[PDB]
């Protein structure tokens, strides 16, 4: 989800872009500015929420030892969904 600053420069996923009066834009003249086109926040927002019929489930990021440390997520609260603090995947009980 790369946006463009009113100056014209691409806004990176950290949201920074040199101001109009910033002299530091001169470093990009006759050259380019590296911006990563894949925004992690959007990509993890596109992941569907997993449906599990268990009160507490574990997430390790997939791949077993190739993921993140295994953590357990509580799904008692129905207002929101359980989110992994490492991977960002979302889990939810089958309401109704």
């Amino acid at each position: 989800g790369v946006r463009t600053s009113p100056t014209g420069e691409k806004v990176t996923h950290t949201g920074q872009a040199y101001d109009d009066g910033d002299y530091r834009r001169v470093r990009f003249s006759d050259r380019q500015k590296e911006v990563n086109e894949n925004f992690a926040i959007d990509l993890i927002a596109e992941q569907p929420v997993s449906e599990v019929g268990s009160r507490v489930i574990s997430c390790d990021g997939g791949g077993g030892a190739l993921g993140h440390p295994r953590v357990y997520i509580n799904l008692d609260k129905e207002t929101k969904t359980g989110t992994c603090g490492y991977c960002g995947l979302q889990f939810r009980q089958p309401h109704h």
């Binding site: 077993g64 030892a65 993921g67 993140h68 440390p69 295994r70």
Partner: peptide, 10 residues
């Protein structure tokens, strides 16, 4: 000595 990666992630 640090443990193995699987132990650290388990």
């Amino acid at each position: 000595s640090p443990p193995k990666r699987a132990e650290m992630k388990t």
